[PDB]
Write a protein that binds this ligand. Structure first.
Ligand code: XAN
Lengths: 142, 48, 609, 876, 159
């Protein structure tokens, strides 16, 4: 999580918090959080209010608000990733990477150490080549 | 001049006693120097 | 987590996707790291000359006294700041800047002839005089003393300045430093030296393992190379180089003062502290070798850690050699009774095993060269220990005991040197030259094995070990020219000191069967080095006859054997024996030596092959 | 960089400067007003009049001193020049002078050098030493102006250079994508640039200064960068009168030093600093570029506000801390929190170094009365909260904060025992400095953990002075602080869901060296044990007197819950420090030793008993309202979560007898209680949510992992059918998150898959009633039935049976037929849904395949079927 | 000249106990025959009761470093602080070791020290560590110096 939020959506979060303004702590209460959530567009439940509210008085400062928002929203950020991943190479549409391209993308871009590609395909012979980007990435990570 | 710790001991009563020394003994510049030391010590100002 | 780094690598978004200001900031940082920092210009010598030049020293219209020059004023300011008593030596940006400037001004930096060699010596002396004529040595000592044993950029800059002004063994700078120390009775200087040498770091295997774990878990070191291992190798090397330069030139006054401060209330034994640090670094090197022993290959990070540790150990060995050369009998006794022998035993074990390990691999040539250069320095230090010894001396007995303790490692080293010294008469044999009718120089593995079997001087184990060490080729043919240049050339260069040490020990301990065993083990190495081991006897400074061992070049032997030199020798012998008086016979002999030294150079010039 | 093509330096200060600078504001001094808001900002003064008078007076003084008359203003040359030059330098620092005034004052300083493109300037008029020092300050400011102009020009060029570089990089990316199919092999090497961090990308893109043909940067871009670099070098002076400020300053300093022996060390230092600055123009940029940041126009106002707040905070460092100054800096810290630039530009924040400023503030506050109770605990808390958020902002910020670990750990005992101050202590700052960062966790040293262990030992040996002063019972140890130290050790040893082996081993070794860190129990020599200690804590919580001080929680500590939390934190830390299964299998001696140590420390029976300890269910009462036990004053499922973690990590579950015994002692009662808490009123209670979280986080995943142990389990049919019924009822219960529901689905599917076919009859009976509804909850039962019938089709179709398992009892067949017909009718009469149909069709196919084609429709129904217990909604 | 401990030497392990505010010297002893467990024999009352040193005398069969011990387990030394030693009972011929079983007198996290025939495993090996700050790791063992022994298997001290 190295600044997973960008200036744009942090700025929109900024007007959303400042719509009640009022020195920041003021008018940012428990009831206002659901209002700002469904002004942004997402609909959390009453429990999805109470969990954050009693995890944190009732007045929420901007640092804590942005921290909880970033923590929850740091997900579903791989969509454009996989889009670009299959758009880069293997344009035939089969969605499967050849053994040569698998070796070529394992050639470490920052570590520069070789033959671990061949080791991985040896240890994943069944996966082989016919290997898809997405199911490959969640097989390959934990 | 030397001890900042001893400067915290000085209070309103001591400052007013020094000012009364100015009032009673006349014009002495050493009293003004002491007041300057009370105001500023080692580059750190004492607002009180 | 390496897999996590890989997926983050795929998910990364490029520069053209990045906004303009973010990329501008990143480019600013990269530009600063790559171009501005790497930009270098040389101004230190000119600046120091301008500062040292007095201005209008006739037109001042004062005539009261000679005003101190700007450089003198700056040095006085720094010296007064150092002399001002404080609990801690505060960091001074002006001090780092100008100490670096003066250090870079006092060096002004193939084959060089005598004329330009003393040109450079005179220039260096003048540049060092520009500083030490204005209190630079005293200021350096004051800063070191005020450091109070705390390592930092101040101590680093002060040590660099001291090295710059002490390069070449500046006798005047040494005398000034000693006079200041004796006059001030500065125990703080020696206490700070001891504290700094204690604070010097060594190889950290735990830190290396943690760094390796971090690298293996896929997270890349965004900063430079991991310096947590051998935190300040340059600082340690500079400190021990300064200590060595204090005693450079066999300056007995420092050689004794560092051991003991006679006129001071308290005394610190710099010699013992140095040997303690040598023991520490030897233990670190041995542990790191034991970490890498099981592995077949050594990575680049490990190899560079070996290189830095080897450089540090070499500097410490040179410092000890400068301590004991002389002779300085007090320092010799101190190191004889110190823990030097254990460190030497550990180094011998490391050398004996690492030579065999790194010979097989073809990517550790530089590491092997560094290691055996360290071995040569260690043997030089041992010879300096043996300096001034008598027959059946205590130091000789102790060194024979050390060899007995390291019997296995010594035997392996001797076998290594014999094995890589027989390569010349293996290759030059006609039974080998017939395998290669042309001068191309490539020979097959099968042919080279058969020639080594037919030579009958290589056993089967040696034959297979040289085959393992042989450089593989796609055509399975090795260039024995590059093979011998890679392996035999380090021999006859590092093995000569071992041969000299063995000969000295044998001649000064004539009744030691333990040493006799090593002599029979090293029979062939001594046989090879006989044509090059020059042996004379001189009238020593201790009012005793001392035997001296040195190196004779085969080129020198050839020029001596050339007919014109022989005719000159015959004429000289007749002249001195018949009519030459015995009163100035040695004078005539030295004159004949100098004329022959020139005649042999001329013969080498005229001869061509 | 240069005003025109003729590359000659312009007059310093003159030009267009766009760098952000503090706003200049003044208040009118009026003593008839009662506003009280004028006490901000300095009082006003006529700045134009002051500027004009200063210029006129400086000109007059220069002309008068050129004559060397014996009548200086004030009686001495120092009295004439030092105050006037001080005022002039102050105005120049303020930036009041503009254009013509700057030209005039520069010509006064040195007419020859500062010509615009019999008269002697200040620099060559035989000035005294204080005047020389002030002139050195003035020349220092001029050099600073030159450096700032260089920085601005560098940024100006950098934009267009980066824009062109980005455009060319996009073009190269597109051409690589187009030539992909032909090139094949080299595509990876061309995309290596597009798969490296942007810092590395720019590093290699700029790596063409000397040779290094390994640079994708084109010739035109390379030439542009080289030309700008040459121009910058020329401006810096790296590569006939002086004609230059640098040459003029160098000559002036050398001439002064060789003309007089300066008796002022400050003057000597200033002169030589100025000379080194002139000779090290590259060093100025080397120092300036790291502190150079660029922003877009939209962020200008926010950046200015943040800089004003930072300036106020920095200025408060020069005044002694008091109530008013503490309030001011708290307000400034809050303003810096609220400013969005603090989150958008952590690199800018670090370059400004406000973390160091707040760190110095905390150092000052602690050092003031470190011996006695710390003054301004509110300020300490605010500083610590700021540092924690600063750590959370970015990883680089966390690494920068890591350098101050020693001080934070030294002062870790600031406010540990005070509640409501959590996350506002130096211990919390250190924990944030190492939390979820594998580099920093591995970089943690052994002395730091030794200090933490020593503090934990002190807490376990001695009570809390503040608590016993407030009136809490004087037990012989400090659970409140021990728990926080244990939490810091947990953060040290556990990172990113993985256990740091080195830190775990070090912590375990230190803990076993100092056994008093385990609390009064587990020490031996009279210690009772984990189970006995937790029962004692239960009794303490039940008895008010030993719990509170007995003179909103506020100052209440709930000492029983404190003891429970301390023991739970210790158990969790040890469990996270436990070695891993792959290392144990490999046979690491250290791992085996650590596992043996932990096993000997914590007996398995104690863990089993503590898990078997029951909770306090919320109870509905008269008036139709629920009474709820307090979370903070009693036993919590978070406590048993640590027990489950330790039992799984150290002892592990690898045998069916232990698995089923643990299920029947500890897990099934909790599952049954959570299922019983599924009514509408009790579902939102704290007990229910906490228990559901604990179950779906620790118990159900453990059962999923140990599912294969349910292979041969014929005799404990009642137990592991009660388990299935409780799991299904709890799944049907509402107020469960998506993750909890998915965990329930996975656990139930795995257990049923590993179970025997003949013994899930009761679960089939429960499902035959709920599946035909085909509501939202039905997807898990449809998947379960599909998998069960696909795996156990032979148990029904073949007359002989699957094997030793047997065959159906004919009421299983009746239930299966009823399920098939109900699903068929529901899907026929149900409106089309994509996923629902896609899940229902395989279930129908599996049931149809499982049912024997010649199965007889039982006109004689099962043996007087007992559906009396079955009900609508209530079901019981 | 203070003598240094060398492998083929017989030694006795003495300890001081200030029981009932009186110093007593106790030698570590064992029977071996029918009693594997170890005990302590008083030597301070030698003028009134003869100590039995035949069961207290130990021999240092081997003295190998930690790395050497690990290598040996995988597949005339002079004693140096840091080596792992093999203390063999002179009478029984068996070796000092930390027994897996414990007397369980509220020690809980401790074992018992006795004798066993087999040298296999790390139970029989003990590592020497310096007593005070003057002595360091890696220097020779002196006759008059105090030391602390750490069991290799149980990482515990003789207590
Ligand atoms: O002192 C010297 N004596 C010589 O004979 C000689 N030859 C070269 N260089 C020399 N130096």
């Amino acid at each position: 999580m190295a600044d997973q939020l960008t200036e744009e959506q942090i700025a929109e979060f900024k007007e959303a918090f400042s719509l009640f303004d009022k020195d920041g702590d003021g008018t940012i209460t428990t009831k206002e959080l659901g209002t700002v959530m469904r002004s942004l567009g997402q609909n959390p439940t009453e429990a999805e209010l109470q969990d954050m509210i009693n995890e944190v008085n009732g007045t929420i400062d901007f640092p804590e608000f942005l921290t909880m928002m970033a923590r929850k929203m740091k997900d579903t950020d791989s969509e454009e990733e996989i889009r670009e991943a299959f758009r880069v190479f293997d344009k035939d549409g089969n969605g499967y990477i050849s053994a040569a391209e698998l070796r070529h993308v394992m050639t470490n871009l920052g570590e520069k150490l070789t033959d671990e590609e061949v080791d991985e395909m040896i240890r994943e012979a069944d996966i082989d080549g016919q290997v898809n980007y997405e199911e490959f990435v969640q097989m390959m990570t934990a | 001049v030397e001890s900042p710790e001893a400067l915290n001991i000085i209070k309103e009563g001591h400052i007013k006693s020094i000012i009364s020394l100015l009032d009673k003994h006349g014009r002495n510049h050493k009293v003004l120097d002491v007041l300057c030391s009370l105001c500023v010590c080692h580059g750190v100002a004492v607002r009180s | 987590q390496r897999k996590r780094a890989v997926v983050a690598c795929f998910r990364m978004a490029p520069l053209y996707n990045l906004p303009r200001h973010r990329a501008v900031n990143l480019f600013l940082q990269g530009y600063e790291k790559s171009w501005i920092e790497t930009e270098e210009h040389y101004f230190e010598d000119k600046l120091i000359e301008d500062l040292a030049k007095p201005g209008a020293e006739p037109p001042e219209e004062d005539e009261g006294t000679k005003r101190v020059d700007p450089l003198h004023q700056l040095i006085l300011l720094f010296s007064r700041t150092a002399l001002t008593e404080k609990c801690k030596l505060e960091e001074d940006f002006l001090y780092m800047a100008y100490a670096d400037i003066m250090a870079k001004s006092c060096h002004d930096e193939e084959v060089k002839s005598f004329e330009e060699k003393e040109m450079e010596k005179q220039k260096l002396l003048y540049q060092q005089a520009r500083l030490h004529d204005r209190g630079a040595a005293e200021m350096v000592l004051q800063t070191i003393s005020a450091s109070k044993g705390e390592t930092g950029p101040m101590v680093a800059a002060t040590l660099k300045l001291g090295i710059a002004i002490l390069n070449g063994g500046n006798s005047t700078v040494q005398q000034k430093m000693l006079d200041y120390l004796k006059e001030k009775k500065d125990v703080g200087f020696f206490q700070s030296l001891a504290g700094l040498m204690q604070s010097c770091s060594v190889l950290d295997l735990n830190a290396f393992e943690r760094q390796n774990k971090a690298e293996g878990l896929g997270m890349v070191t965004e900063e430079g190379s991991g310096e947590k291992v051998l935190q300040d190798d340059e600082f340690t090397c500079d400190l021990f180089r300064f200590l060595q330069l204090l005693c450079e030139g066999h300056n007995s006054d420092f050689q004794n003062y560092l051991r003991t401060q006679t006129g001071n209330n308290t005394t610190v034994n710099i010699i013992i502290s140095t040997v303690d640090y040598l023991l520490r670094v030897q233990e670190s090197i041995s542990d790191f070798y034991w970490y890498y022993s099981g592995k077949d290959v050594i990575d680049e990070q490990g190899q560079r850690n070996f290189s830095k540790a080897i450089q540090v150990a070499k500097q410490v060995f040179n410092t000890l050699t400068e301590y004991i050369q002389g002779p300085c009998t007090g320092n010799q006794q101190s190191l004889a009774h110190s823990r030097l022998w254990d460190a030497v035993v550990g180094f011998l074990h490391v050398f004996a095993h690492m030579q065999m390990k790194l010979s097989q691999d073809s990517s550790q040539i530089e590491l092997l060269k560094e290691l055996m250069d360290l071995q040569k320095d260690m043997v030089v230090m041992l010879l300096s220990m043996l300096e001034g010894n008598v027959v059946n001396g205590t130091i000789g007995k102790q060194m024979v005991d050390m060899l007995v303790e390291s019997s296995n490692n010594v035997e392996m080293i001797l076998k290594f040197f014999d094995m890589f010294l027989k390569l010349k008469d293996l290759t030059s044999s006609d039974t080998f030259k017939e395998y290669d009718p042309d001068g191309k120089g490539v020979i097959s593995k099968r042919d080279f094995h058969k020639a080594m079997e037919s030579h009958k001087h290589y056993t089967q184990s040696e034959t297979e070990f040289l085959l393992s060490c042989a450089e593989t080729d796609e055509n399975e043919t090795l260039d024995y020219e590059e093979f011998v240049k890679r392996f035999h050339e380090p021999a006859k260069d590092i093995g000569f000191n071992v041969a000299v040490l063995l000969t000295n020990l044998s001649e000064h301990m004539p009744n030691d069967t333990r040493l006799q065993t090593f002599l029979e083990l090293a029979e062939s190495v001594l046989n090879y080095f006989q044509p090059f081991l020059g042996r004379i006897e001189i009238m020593g400074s201790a009012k005793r006859i001392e035997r001296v061992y040195f190196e004779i070049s085969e080129s020198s032997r050839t020029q001596w054997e050339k007919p014109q030199v022989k005719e000159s020798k015959r004429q000289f012998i007749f002249d001195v024996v018949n009519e030459g008086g015995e009163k100035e016979k040695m004078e005539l002999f030295v004159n004949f030596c100098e004329d022959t030294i020139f005649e042999m150079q001329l013969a080498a010039q005229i001869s061509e092959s | 960089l240069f005003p025109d093509e003729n590359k000659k330096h312009g007059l310093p200060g003159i030009g267009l400067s766009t760098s952000l600078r503090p706003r200049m504001q003044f208040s009118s001094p009026s003593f008839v007003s009662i506003s009280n808001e004028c006490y901000q900002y300095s009082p006003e003064f006529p700045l134009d009049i002051l500027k004009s008078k200063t210029i006129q007076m400086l000109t007059e003084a220069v002309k008068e001193g050129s004559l060397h008359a014996r009548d200086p203003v004030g009686g001495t040359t120092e009295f004439l020049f030092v105050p006037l030059i001080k005022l002039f330098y102050t105005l120049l620092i303020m930036g009041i002078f503009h254009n013509e005034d700057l030209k005039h004052i520069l010509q006064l300083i040195e007419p020859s050098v500062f010509k615009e493109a019999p008269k002697e300037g200040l620099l060559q008029m035989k000035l005294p030493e204080p005047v020389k020092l002030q002139m050195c300050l003035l020349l220092q400011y001029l050099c600073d102006c030159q450096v700032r102009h260089r920085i601005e020009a560098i940024v100006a060029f950098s934009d267009d250079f980066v824009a062109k570089l980005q455009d060319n990089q996009r073009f190269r990316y597109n051409e690589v994508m187009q030539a992909l199919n032909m090139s094949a092999a080299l595509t990876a090497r061309k995309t290596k640039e597009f798969r490296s961090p942007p810092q590395e990308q720019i590093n290699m893109l700029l790596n063409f200064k000397d040779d290094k043909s390994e640079c994708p940067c084109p010739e035109e871009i390379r030439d542009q960068l080289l030309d700008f670099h040459e121009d910058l070098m020329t401006h810096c002076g790296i590569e006939k009168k002086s004609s230059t400020l640098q040459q003029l300053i160098s000559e002036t300093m050398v001439r002064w030093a060789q003309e007089s022996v300066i008796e002022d060390p400050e003057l000597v230092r200033a002169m030589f600093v100025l000379l080194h600055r002139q000779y090290d123009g590259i060093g100025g940029l080397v120092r300036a570029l790291p502190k150079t940041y660029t922003i877009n126009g939209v962020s200008v106002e926010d950046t200015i506000n943040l800089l004003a707040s930072l300036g106020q905070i920095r200025s408060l460092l020069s005044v002694r801390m008091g109530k008013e100054e503490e309030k001011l800096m708290i307000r400034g810290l809050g303003d810096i929190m609220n400013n969005k630039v603090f989150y958008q530009h952590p690199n800018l924040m670090r370059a400004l170094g406000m973390h160091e400023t707040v760190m110095e503030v905390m150092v000052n506050v602690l050092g003031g009365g470190e011996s006695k109770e710390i003054t301004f605990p509110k300020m300490v808390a605010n500083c610590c909260r700021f540092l924690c958020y600063f750590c959370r902002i970015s990883r680089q910020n966390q690494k920068a904060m890591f350098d101050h670990l020693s001080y934070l750990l030294e002062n870790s005992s600031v406010g540990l025992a005070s509640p409501a101050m959590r996350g506002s202590t130096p211990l919390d700052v250190a924990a944030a400095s190492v939390m979820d960062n594998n580099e920093l966790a591995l970089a943690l040293r052994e002395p730091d953990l030794e200090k933490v262990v020593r503090y934990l030992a002190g807490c376990g040996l001695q009570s809390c002075q503040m608590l016993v002063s407030k009136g809490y019972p004087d037990i012989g140890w400090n659970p409140v602080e021990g728990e926080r130290y244990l939490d810091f050790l947990r953060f040290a040893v556990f990172c990113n869901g993985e256990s740091v082996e080195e830190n775990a081993n070090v912590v375990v070794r230190l803990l076993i060296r100092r056994p008093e860190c385990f609390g009064p129990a587990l020490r031996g020599e009279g210690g009772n044990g984990l189970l006995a200690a937790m029962e004692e804590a239960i009794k303490i919580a039940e008895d008010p007197s030993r719990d509170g001080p007995s003179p909103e929680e506020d100052d209440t500590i709930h000492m029983g819950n404190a003891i429970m939390t301390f023991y739970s934190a210790l158990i969790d830390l040890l469990g996270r420090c436990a070695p891993e299964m792959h290392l144990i299998h490999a046979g690491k001696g250290e791992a085996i030793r650590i596992r043996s140590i932990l096993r000997s420390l914590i007996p398995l029976g104690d863990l089993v008993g503590v898990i078997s300890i029951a909770f306090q269910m919320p109870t509905i009462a008269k008036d139709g309202n629920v009474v709820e036990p307090d979370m903070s004053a009693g036993f919590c499922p978070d406590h048993k979560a640590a027990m489950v973690l330790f039992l799984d990590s150290v002892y592990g579950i690898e045998v069916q007898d232990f698995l089923l015994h643990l299920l029947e002692v500890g897990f099934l009662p909790d599952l049954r209680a959570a299922a019983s808490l599924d009514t509408a009123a009790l579902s939102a209670t704290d007990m229910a949510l906490a228990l559901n979280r604990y179950l779906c986080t620790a118990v159900l995943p453990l059962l999923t992992r140990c599912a294969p142990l349910f292979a041969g389990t014929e005799h404990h049919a009642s137990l592991i059918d009660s388990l299935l019924h409780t799991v299904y009822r709890l799944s049907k219960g509402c107020s469960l998150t998506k993750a909890q529901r998915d965990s329930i689905e996975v656990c139930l599917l795995s257990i049923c898959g590993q179970l025997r076919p003949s013994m899930m009859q009761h679960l089939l009976r429960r499902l035959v009633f709920d599946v035909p509804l085909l509501n939202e909850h039905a997807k898990m039962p449809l998947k379960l039935l599909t998998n069960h019938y696909e795996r156990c089709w032979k148990y029904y179709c073949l007359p002989g049976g699957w094997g030793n398992f047997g065959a159906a009892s004919e009421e299983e067949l009746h239930l299966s037929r009823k399920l098939f017909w109900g699903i068929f009718d529901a899907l026929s009469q149900k409106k089309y849904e994509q996923e629902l149909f896609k899940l229902a069709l395989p279930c129908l196919s599996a049931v149809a395949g499982a049912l024997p084609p010649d199965y007889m429709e039982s006109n004689y129904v099962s043996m007087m079927e007992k559906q009396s217990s079955m009900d609508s909604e209530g079901n019981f | 000249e203070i003598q240094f401990l060398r492998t083929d030497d017989e030694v006795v392990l003495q300890c001081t106990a200030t029981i009932h505010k009186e110093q007593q010297k106790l030698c570590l002893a064992a029977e071996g025959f029918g009693n594997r467990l170890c005990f302590l024999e008083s030597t301070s009352n030698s003028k009134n009761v003869p100590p039995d040193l035949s069961i207290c005398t130990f021999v240092l069969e081997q003295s190998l470093s930690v790395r050497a011990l690990q290598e040996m387990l995988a597949n005339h030394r002079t004693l140096l602080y840091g080596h792992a030693i093999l203390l063999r009972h002179s009478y029984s011929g068996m070796y000092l070791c930390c027994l897996s079983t414990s007397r369980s007198s509220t020690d809980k996290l401790a074992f018992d020290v006795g004798l066993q025939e087999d040298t296999t495993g790390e139970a029989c090996w003990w590592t020497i560590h310096p007593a005070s700050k003057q002595r360091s790791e890696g220097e020779k063992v002196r006759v008059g110096d105090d030391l602390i022994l750490v069991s290799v298997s149980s990482e515990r001290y003789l207590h």
